[PDB]
Design a binder for this molecule. Structure first.
Ligand SMILES: Nc1ncnc2c1ncn2[C@@H]1O[C@H](COP(=O)(O)OP(=O)(O)O)[C@@H](O)[C@H]1O
Ligand SMILES: [Mg+2]
Length: 504
C-alpha cells in the first residue's frame, strides 16, 4: 500500500519529501532539483510546470504565477477562452510532484499530507484538499506550515516551550508563535506581510540595473520582455550567490542595441551594495515580528526557540536582523527550503505507521504452584503469564531435621491445595540435618514455548536435585479450565483460609 508523501505546495516553490527507511528524504524532480517552481504555463496546449514554465514567465502571457494567492476564492484564470480555478492549476503542480515522487519511489503514490499557511480559512484549506483530489491524491491530512517546520526539528519530542517561526519565502512573510504543550502544538499568534519576499529582493536588483542602463544609454530594458526575463533570472542568481560570497558578476552580453550596434550590461554587485538596496525590505520584516509578540502577550524573553523557514532566510542581512531583534541565535539546522515538506513527510510516516493488527500469544491458562505447609496452595507462575517463562522460589524445611521435602505441583486459583488440580509429585531426599527453616530448596518451574512445564527442586547448599516434566493428559482443557476459573472467585471467602496462620 502507498506511502504518504509530504507536500509543501508553496506560493513560489513546491517540495515533496517521503519517509523511506527511517529517514525523511526530499525527492529530487526530473531535472535533479529538490524544489520546483509553483508555476504553470500553457504554451502549446501542453501544460508546462516547474523551471521550464518559470524560464518563460515574463516572455509568455499565459503563465500562472503564485496562484496560491487565489486559493479559496472564486477567481478564474482564462487561457485561450478557457477558465481554470485555482484548485485546478494547483492540481497540475500537484500531478507533477506526485509523478516524480512515483519515479523516485518506483511505485504509485496515492496519499499525501498537504501543508498550508496557519492563517488559511475553511475555503482556503478546502481548495487545497480539492486540488489534491483532482491530482489523484487522498489528502490524509492538512497541517500548517509553522507546525510542519517544528516537526522537522523534532520539537514535539521535547519539553513544553514557546517557539517563534520566522518564514520569509519568495512572495510572503509569516511569523507564528507556537507553544508546545505536552507534545502538541498550538498557534498563539500569527502576523505577516503577504507582499514581502525574495521576489522583492530581486526587484531591488532589477531596478538598480535598468536605471544604470537608462542613464548610460537612455534605454529602458524593462520595456523588452526578453531583456527583462534575462534580468529577472540574473538578478535572482546574483542575490543567491551573495548569500555565500561578498562579490558577484551580473553579466548580460547582447542585452540590447542602439545606433552603434550591440549593448552589453556588465557590472559587479557587492553584498554591501545589495544590502543597501534592500535594507528597507529587511526592516519591513520587524513589524510583523513585534505585532505577533503583542498579540501573544509575549516579549523576546518568552521565546525559547526561533526557527527559520524560507529560502530568503539564507540572506545574511536577514538572519542578522532577527538575531538582533530577538537577541537569540536562530535555528537553521534543517534546510529552510525543504523544512516544511520534511515535517509533512514525518506526519505522513506517522499516519502510515499506524498498526492495528493483533498477534496471537500463548499465555499460562491457570496459576501454577506447589503445596505448602497447612494444605495451602503457593503459586509461582500466575495465570495469563506469557510463555516461555521461568520462575524460581526458595522454600525451606518445616521441621527440624527434615531430610526430605515432598514437591506437590498444583494448577488452579483457590487458596487451599485441596481445591486445585494435582499435576504431579516427586520428592527431594538427602537434605543435611539442620534446624527448621534453615535449608534452602530452590524450586524452579520452566515452561517452554509449547506449554509444557518442568519442575526442579534443588538443595542450594548441596546442589542435589530432582525434577519431572509435568505432563499432559496434562489434565485440563476446555470446560474445566473456565469452571474452576469462575468457581474460585465465586466461592471466595474461605480465603478465610488465612485461618492457616497456624503459627509457629
Ligand atoms: N541562497 C539564497 N539566498 C537568498 N535567497 C534564496 C536563496 N535560495 C533561494 N532563495 C529565495 O527563496 C525564495 C523561495 O523561497 P521558498 O521558501 O523556496 O518559497 P515559497 O514562498 O514558495 O515557500 C526565492 O525568492 C529564492 O530566490
Ligand atoms: Mg513556504
Amino acid at each position: 500500500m502507498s506511502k504518504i508523501i509530504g507536500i509543501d505546495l508553496g506560493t513560489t516553490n513546491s517540495c515533496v519529501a517521503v519517509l523511506e527507511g527511517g529517514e525523511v528524504k526530499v525527492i529530487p524532480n526530473p531535472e535533479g532539483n529538490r524544489t520546483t517552481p509553483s508555476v504553470v504555463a500553457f504554451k502549446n496546449g501542453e501544460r508546462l510546470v516547474g523551471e521550464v514554465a518559470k524560464r518563460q514567465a515574463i516572455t509568455n502571457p499565459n503563465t500562472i504565477i503564485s496562484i496560491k494567492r487565489h486559493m479559496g476564492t472564486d477567481y478564474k484564470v482564462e487561457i485561450e477562452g478557457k477558465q481554470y480555478t485555482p484548485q485546478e492549476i494547483s492540481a497540475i503542480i500537484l500531478q507533477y510532484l506526485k509523478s516524480y515522487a512515483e519515479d523516485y519511489l518506483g511505485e504509485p503514490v496515492t496519499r499525501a499530507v498537504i501543508t498550508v499557511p496557519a492563517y488559511f480559512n475553511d475555503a482556503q484549506r478546502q481548495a487545497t484538499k480539492d486540488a489534491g483530489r483532482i491530482a489523484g491524491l487522498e489528502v490524509e491530512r492538512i497541517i500548517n506550515e509553522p507546525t510542519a517546520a517544528a516537526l522537522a526539528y523534532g520539537l514535539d519530542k521535547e519539553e513544553d516551550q514557546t517557539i517563534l517561526v520566522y518564514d520569509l519565502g519568495g512572495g510572503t512573510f509569516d511569523v507564528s508563535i507556537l507553544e508546545l504543550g505536552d507534545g502538541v502544538f498550538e498557534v498563539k499568534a500569527t502576523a505577516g506581510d503577504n507582499h514581502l519576499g525574495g521576489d522583492d529582493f530581486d526587484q531591488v536588483i532589477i531596478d538598480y540595473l535598468v536605471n544604470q542602463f537608462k542613464q548610460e544609454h537612455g534605454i529602458d530594458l524593462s520595456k523588452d520582455k526578453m531583456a527583462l526575463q534575462r534580468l529577472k533570472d540574473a538578478a535572482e542568481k546574483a542575490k543567491k550567490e551573495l548569500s555565500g560570497v561578498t562579490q558577484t558578476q551580473i553579466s548580460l552580453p547582447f542585452i540590447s542595441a542602439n545606433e552603434n550596434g550591440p549593448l552589453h550590461l556588465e557590472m559587479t554587485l557587492t553584498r554591501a551594495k545589495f544590502e543597501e538596496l534592500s535594507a528597507h525590505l529587511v526592516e519591513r520584516t520587524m513589524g510583523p515580528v513585534r505585532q505577533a509578540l503583542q498579540d501573544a502577550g509575549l516579549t523576546p524573553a518568552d521565546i525559547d526557540k526561533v526557527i527559520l523557514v524560507g529560502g530568503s532566510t539564507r540572506i545574511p542581512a536577514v538572519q542578522e536582523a532577527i538575531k538582533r531583534e530577538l537577541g537569540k541565535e536562530p535555528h537553521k539546522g534543517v534546510n529552510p527550503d525543504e523544512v516544511v515538506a520534511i515535517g509533512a513527510a514525518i506526519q505522513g510516516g506517522v499516519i502510515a505507521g499506524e498498526v492495528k493488527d493483533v498477534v496471537l500469544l500463548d499465555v499460562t491458562p491457570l496459576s501454577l504452584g506447589i503445596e505448602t505447609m497447612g494444605g495451602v496452595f503457593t503459586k509461582l507462575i500466575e495465570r495469563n503469564t506469557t510463555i516461555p517463562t521461568s520462575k524460581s522460589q526458595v522454600f525451606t524445611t518445616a521441621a527440624d531435621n527434615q531430610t526430605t521435602v515432598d514437591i506437590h505441583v498444583l494448577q488452579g486459583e483457590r487458596p487451599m491445595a485441596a481445591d486445585n488440580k494435582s499435576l504431579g509429585r516427586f520428592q527431594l531426599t538427602g537434605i543435611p540435618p539442620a534446624p527448621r527453616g534453615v535449608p534452602q530448596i530452590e524450586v524452579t518451574f520452566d515452561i517452554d514455548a509449547n506449554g509444557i512445564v518442568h519442575v526442579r527442586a534443588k538443595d542450594l547448599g548441596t546442589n542435589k536435585e530432582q525434577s519431572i516434566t509435568i505432563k499432559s493428559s496434562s489434565g485440563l482443557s476446555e470446560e474445566e479450565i473456565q469452571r474452576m476459573i469462575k468457581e474460585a472467585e465465586e466461592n471466595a471467602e474461605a480465603d478465610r483460609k488465612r485461618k492457616e496462620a497456624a503459627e509457629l
